[model samples]
Structures are given as C-alpha cells and as structure tokens.
Target: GSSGSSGDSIVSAEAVWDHVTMANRELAFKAGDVIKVLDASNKDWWWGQIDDEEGWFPASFVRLWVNQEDEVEEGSGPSSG
Candidate 1:
C-alpha cells in the first residue's frame, strides 16, 4: 500500500545556471544564490522568491534542496573549541 503526503514542506533551490530577463516576469539572479519556491503548479516554469524579490524562472536553472535538519552546528568564537 502507498501513503499520501499532505501540506507543504520547507524547501529551497540553489541556482546553478544564471538566469536573467528584461521583463519582470522572470527573476534576475546569478549562480550560487538560493531561492525558495512559492508555487510550482506549472512544473516547467517555477515561481520562486529570493529575499525581497519574486518571479518565475526555468526549473532547470536551479537545483532542489530540502531542509531536513541534518546538520546542527554551534557558533564560533575567538577561542575555538
């Protein structure tokens, strides 16, 4: 038997390919920037948000990354532990 999942999980995507467009329809971002997907009903083109900016861009341009809380690290200080 298979189980069905409900609701949205915390997810983010990292920009691998730089995407930029003159119109406001698409987002302008460079590689290495992380984007949060707002809506993805249209699989080909995803709606994402980066900080205060939001727009649609090609799904292939970014790589998917989910928050699993796998890593937990403490803050650093002058005197390292």
Candidate 2:
C-alpha cells in the first residue's frame, strides 16, 4: 500500500461529541477527550488511540486539529460558494 508521503507527524483529534459504541470493534471515548489518530484510511471510520485503548471510531465524532497558527481577517462580504 504505497501512497503520497508528506511526512510522519503527530496527528491529533478532539472528541467534540461523546461516542458510545455497542460494537466491540469500535471505540468509546468521552467528550472533550483528545485522541491520537494512528490510521485514517477510511473516511467515515478512523483508527485512533486514547490512553491504553485503541479501536476504530467515527471520524464525525472527532475533530482533526492541525497546528497552523494564522491570523484571522475581519471582513463581511458575500463570496462565491
């Protein structure tokens, strides 16, 4: 499985919503908990690890956080969608 390589770095995600799963293959994490994504091959399902537990979790429940500190611009105008 060869793909484009940018660099191996720490990819982190925050649980915006609590994910409670009945399936054994899925992971259940608390809200506001930060999860480190190990594998994100699947768009809907992502393999993440939090604490000592590691399993597949919903990508929708988590928010990916990339460190890009940029200044915000204040403007109010209608732009093309």
Candidate 3:
C-alpha cells in the first residue's frame, strides 16, 4: 500500500515543506509544521496544502508525531495542525 501502513490508520502532521519557486531548489522540509490532505489517492503521494498554500507532495515529506483523534479540531485544524 502507498500509505506504508493500514489504510484506515490516521496519520498526524509532523512537518511542512514549502514549495520553492526556484528551479534549482532541492526538496526539503522544515520541522514543526503541518501538511493537510485535500486529496489522498496513493500511499506515497497526497495532494494537500502547506500553510494554506496548496500543492502535492510525497508522503515521505510528512512525519507523523501526534495522533489526531479527528481530522478537524479547534485552533489546530488541518490547515494549522
């Protein structure tokens, strides 16, 4: 499976990677950030937004550190988890 775990398992947001406009920029991510899923079709790839900027990134870019009981929450929803 592309998710690398159970299909029904919920993954937490751990890091955020900003999409660089520079063509030479390498794919890197910053810690203490979150990526929220707008679409998930495969285990390794998901379409989402980083800090309200929408984009598609590999699942490897996300690091699950906290287990979210629900996809939506107060002050820490998918857009700001």
Candidate 4:
C-alpha cells in the first residue's frame, strides 16, 4: 500500500520475507506483503518497495506478474458482428 512510485505491483507467492528497515535496519514484514518491482527484467532479484521502504527480494520466492498480451486470431480477435 505504500513505498511505490507508480510502478507495477506484484504479489508474494511463497513466504513472508523480511526486510531491513530504512531508518532502523530492523526486521520488517514476514510475508503476505505486496511490493512494486523497480525492475521486471532483473530475475535474479527484484527491487521491492513496501510501506515506503525498499529492499531486494529473491525472484524465486514470489509469484511474478506477466504482461497482458494475448494473441487472439488476428481478424477474429473481436467484432461487433
């Protein structure tokens, strides 16, 4: 709900991973948290932002998002017929 900058939001798939607090470097969040990925191209790790805080979470732990681009049969895609 926070810590995002107009970026696409992805959901946590596996566990309630923790993050080092920005000001305190303390433990933050266990799991079930949503984060906005700063870069989708980075599969090794995704820069996640939550509650105005930011950190790196492994791509293996979360169920990433997919771009909505379906290839419908060209001319038959949609019609008012």
Can you give the TM-score per candidate against the true fold?
0.65, 0.65, 0.44, 0.42
Residue pairs in steric clash, candidate 2? none
Q: Over the stretch 9-81, how does candidate 3's per-residue lDDT look in tens digits? A: 4445665455444443333345655666655778787765666455665676565556455555448546754
RMSD of each: 9.7, 9.0, 11.7, 13.6
In candidate 3 the C-alpha lDDT for residue 60 amounts to 69
Root-mean-square deviation of candidate 3: 11.7
Q: Model 4: runs farther than 4 Å from truth?
A: 1-28, 65-81
The candidate 3 region of ten consecutive residues with least summed lDDT is 19-28
Backbone clashes, candidate 1: 0
Best by TM-score: 2
Candidate order by TM-score, highest to lowest?
Answer: 2, 1, 3, 4
Off by over 4 Å in 3: 1-12, 16-29, 65-81
- Candidate 3's error at 45, in angstroms? 0.2
Error of 2 at 60 (Å): 0.9
> Candidate 2, residue 77: CA error in Å?
28
Clashes by residue pair, model 4: 3-52, 16-30, 16-31
lDDT of 4 by residue, 21-47 (tens): 565443245666666665656656556
Question: What is each predicted model's overall lDDT from 0 to 1?
Answer: 0.77, 0.78, 0.57, 0.55
How many pairs of residues collide in each model? 0, 0, 2, 3
Model 1 misplacement above 4 A: 1-6, 66-81
Model 2, CA-based lDDT:
0.78
